[model samples]
Target: AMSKLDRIRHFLNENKSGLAIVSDPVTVNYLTGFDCDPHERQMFLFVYENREPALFVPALEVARASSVLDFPVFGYVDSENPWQKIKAGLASTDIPIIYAEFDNLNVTKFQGLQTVFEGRFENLTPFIHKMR
Candidate 1:
């Protein structure tokens, strides 16, 4: 199965193409042309397989982000869950086996999302590792 760097792409790809929550600046810039740093703020691009990826940014973040991404841009204030928004993002309840950039996530973030998908995770990532 494929996985990472993009969410909806992998979502649509379903168990095959997995999605990735890119944190590495260079990787982000390489996959997406938006070479930016959130600094004190936060920024993330959840790329899917079939569905388009959404850039979750703060309101202020969107000003500069508006012109970059070619997908949905969400401005979540107060760290609210985007369950409804995520549901709306999909065309159906059918979701593929999902995974993320494991090392960067916190307990709350992971646990909170687990409720939506109703599962833990397989074990993979985009180019999960380099040829050694």
Candidate 2:
């Protein structure tokens, strides 16, 4: 059986998407089993169709998150720009389409994503709803 992350990667591959930024707290916890409520901070599960998956969390959660997750873990403190950290952690910025939960992401954060790359955001919420 495919793992949860595998299913996500498969979805990305079939859709010909370069990346998926899963930002919903509930969905992030569900997908990675990290179980964090970042509150006003940022936490994202970045699933790359062509590469290994990664977790981006607040710096405060990094140690705990890294201890449990097998993949790479990237974090940023409140002082840093989370979007810049995201850009640096990404394999590439030339993505054409990025799958994200439109229901969960706010316009401000969506614009933040836009600053990192010139990609479009497709709704990953429907797929996740079906999976759940």
Candidate 3:
């Protein structure tokens, strides 16, 4: 069986623009070589073409995130908002399409992301649903 990382690397290479996944624990570990507590808040991992991964973490866990993350890390304030920064990062991308793992996203958050990126969002859970 191919490891999750192997699958992701393959996807990145096969696709022209590449993929962007939310910072869920499983995905973070699979993509960035680190996993951390979800703790009911939000985090994000963005991997771009020909560049190192970028991690967006809450301020409280910034130090811990920095230590474990293999790529460049950007921190949000404990009470400070990071939505704008995250949006900016997405807008900066030349990738025309962005793929999101619907199984791991909250509807409200996904809506927020859509409003930010204004790009099509793909749900990657039909296979899981069919398996059930």
Candidate 4:
């Protein structure tokens, strides 16, 4: 098994620019050694270029998440509001293309991100299909 830090380092090297992985329990655990409560609202894991991963969590779960993870955590109350913070966090990067998991993103959220960034969005999930 790979250590959490190693796995993250590998992912960062593989993706060159930046990677924003939404909170899935398995992924979160793999990257941060924390498995959040299933009943809890969603969280986000943002990995930036050549930087440590950051966790965006609900305010209610901040303490719990912080206890088990070792990354900078930004807590938010509203889902919509968190995107603004995410946008600010992404401001340093000049990467014009944003890759999003289309099948995983709700239409509204995806549309909102598209409007907010005003850039092209590519669906990475289909890359697997295209190769076959």
> Which candidate's lDDT is highest?
2
Could you give the C-alpha RMSD of every candidate to the true structure, in order shown?
Answer: 5.0, 1.0, 3.8, 4.7
In model 2, what are the clashing residue pairs, if there are any? none
Candidate order by TM-score, decreasing, is 2, 3, 4, 1
Which digits, one per residue and each the tens of the lDDT, describe model 4 over residues 1-132? 866555544544565534444444555665567777544344666655456667767778778888877777767676557667666655443445555556656776676565456545656345323422
Q: What is the lDDT of candidate 2?
A: 0.90
lDDT, residue 110, candidate 1: 63
For model 2, what is the alpha-carbon lDDT of residue 13? 89
Off by over 4 Å in 1: 1-27, 35-42, 79-94, 123-128
Every model's TM-score: 0.61, 0.95, 0.73, 0.64
Name the runs in model 4 displaced over 4 angstroms.
1-5, 8-16, 37-42, 88-94, 97-100, 115-132
TM-score of candidate 2 to 2 decimals: 0.95
- Provide the overall lDDT of each model, using Cα atoms, as 2-decimal numbers: 0.54, 0.90, 0.62, 0.58
The digit string of per-residue lDDT tens for model 1 on 1-132 reads 432344335343656744445444455566667677755444556655555666765566666666886666766554654554544544433445565656655566566456555434554334444310
Question: What are the per-residue Cα lDDT tens digits for candidate 3 across 1-132?
Answer: 865544554555665446555545776765556777757666877755455667777767767878886666776664755677676654454456666678788887787666666555554444223322
Q: For each predicted model, how many residue pairs clash, with residues at least 3 apart or on different chains?
A: 20, 0, 0, 0
- The list of candidate 2 runs beyond 4 A from truth reads none
Better of 1 and 2 by lDDT: 2
Number of the top-ranking candidate, with TM-score as the measure? 2
